[PDB]
Amino acid sequence: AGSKNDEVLGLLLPIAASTDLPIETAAMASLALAHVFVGTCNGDITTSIMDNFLERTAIELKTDWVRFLALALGILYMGQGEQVDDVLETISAIEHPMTSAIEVLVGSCAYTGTGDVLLIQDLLHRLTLAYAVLGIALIALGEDIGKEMSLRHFGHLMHYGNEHIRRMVPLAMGIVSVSDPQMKVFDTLTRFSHDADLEVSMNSIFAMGLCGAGTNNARLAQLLRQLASYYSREQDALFITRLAQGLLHLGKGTMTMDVFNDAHVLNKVTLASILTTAVGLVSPSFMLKHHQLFYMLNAGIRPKFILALNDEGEPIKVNVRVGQPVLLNHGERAELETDEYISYTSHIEGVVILKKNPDYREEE
Amino acid sequence: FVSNSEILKPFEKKQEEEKKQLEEIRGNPLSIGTLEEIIDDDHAIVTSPTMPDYYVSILSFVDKELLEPGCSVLLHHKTMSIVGVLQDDADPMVSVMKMDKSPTESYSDIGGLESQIQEIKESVELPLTHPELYEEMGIKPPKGVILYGAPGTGKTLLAKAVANQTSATFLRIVGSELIQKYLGDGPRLCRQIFKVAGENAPSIVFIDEIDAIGTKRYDSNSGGEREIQRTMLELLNQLDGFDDRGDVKVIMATNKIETLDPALIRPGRIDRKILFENPDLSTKKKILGIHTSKMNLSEDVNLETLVTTKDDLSGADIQAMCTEAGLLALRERRMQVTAEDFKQAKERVMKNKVEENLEGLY
């Protein structure tokens, strides 16, 4: 991503044509190509991928392949209006419940932005499938109204008995809960950890770890206490909890998740990353594959930053207010500090090049 | 929109067939009742709300692990068997409760109480947002505060304001009103207060005016009444049973502390003693400043002029002054309120309140 090229696509493309997953492997290649060619214009991929699906090449009768070709098209062509119609025919061609959810998402991506009632409404009727609950997250950032409801709304869904609803909501939470505490879900999860089965315990603790990522001490506490209270009592338990402690403290505990930023703009990349890890990361859950896929979760993960710079605009001493610990030198961890000082261009959050008034002219 | 209807109608239909099949097995009509106790031999003794008790068998919709004592339940009529579970939100569980989930009142709306504002903030708001300062040092937090003064102006305002800031359920119970005249029923009523709290946290528990059930006497013979003391003790034992870092902060109202037990203070719980005073010049300036925003008025009126003739009054007097003043302006048929109007109004309420007098200059 950011250095996309046709040459690898040409080499990879007929091997994708060979298609069975345990051998030539390139059925999954589709995920990788999609994420590379995110958010831009490139008809070659769209067409090649589109024919191969519609034709029903090689060993096309595997479910995983129908999934890969559907998703690949949608992921790559984000924000391409009319062009997008081609993709809509393939995805539409094999109906699913994932697909009724995805009609609104492709429309968001293509027509540019979100802000209308319809798209929240159309999902809301299905909710009250995995992809559908995931989808409120992606939609709500443009909805002025939408964000406050999201946190209550998926809180309810976790508790729902049925096993599928139980796997899918924790991943969504693992992203969410590093900036949005919700009491209800964390308190529930403790009982569900010993509910009736080994697999549910695997997922629970792993889930607590995602949610804990980059966030430590304070308001987290009710979730934090549950994690400490497990370490081992079995060899399966030892293994899972240890993996949880790395997640909990990923990037030395001071990393964050944002799917929207303070510089008023969204990221296409970040929607695609989450989408692609969802197809993967299933090793200790339903939809089993292999362990390596965990790592795709990384692309989403951001260091926290407010970066002051003085009048040089490149690293130079400059001070802005205290953290939790003192007033800061440049590049020194902390986030969201507004200041007195006047920018060159626009006082807001983010990397800022700053200038100080001549009445107390300073490097600060 | 169009998309929902196409899907909705075939989707609705399968559900209804299943739903009909469910409905037939479980029956109707039913009495609602309350579980007396839950028994693990798959039985239940239940309290029927018509009165009598029946030792009944559960009909499987839920287990006895998906049931709790005092849950509301659907009862048949066979012997009153448990058909299904029902929520307790609707069916009574209250003493005297005003529930105001996130109240209208806020610090901004009651002017400058700023010094009082600061105390209540470090005790009640700060743990809920930040367990972390208490945790790091390793000290317990105040989980109670006491508000002293008169309500509507001191005790009531600060407590409404803070709840709105923390986005917690404000529960006002009137202490005296429980002061029921029959032996034994205060203690039930205290139980229901604590029961609701633990179910429905975060919450601010406001107990108004505990000085009728708050008594603790020296006797129970010779005009001594035994209920009053019992109720005071049940209240105390639950309070000391509950401890939190940010699930419950308790606000009390009362104007005597030597009618209360030293274990209802419980030193190491109630650290904070917040009391109303009459405000400073600066804070008075702020109370005036907000209230005149809302007026249309002359420009001969100043905040400064109004301050100097004030001797330190409550914020309530300042509010009262504004309503009285506008009424002389509306009587003169006009919407301009002079410096003279607010001055006539202030003098008049001050005069009605200060019924006792004492020469202090000598």
Binding site: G161, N162, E163, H164 | I25, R26, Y54, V56, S57, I58, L59, S60, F61, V62, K78, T79, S81
Partner: peptide, 29 residues
């Protein structure tokens, strides 16, 4: 998986129990 398991259990048990209690209620309980 889980949702279907719970409901079947609850219908199955309930019909047997409903027959047994009614039998013990005969007499006038």
């Amino acid at each position: 998986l889980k949702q279907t398991e719970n409901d079947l259990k609850d219908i199955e048990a309930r019909i047997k129990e409903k027959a047994g209690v009614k039998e013990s209620d005969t007499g006038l309980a």
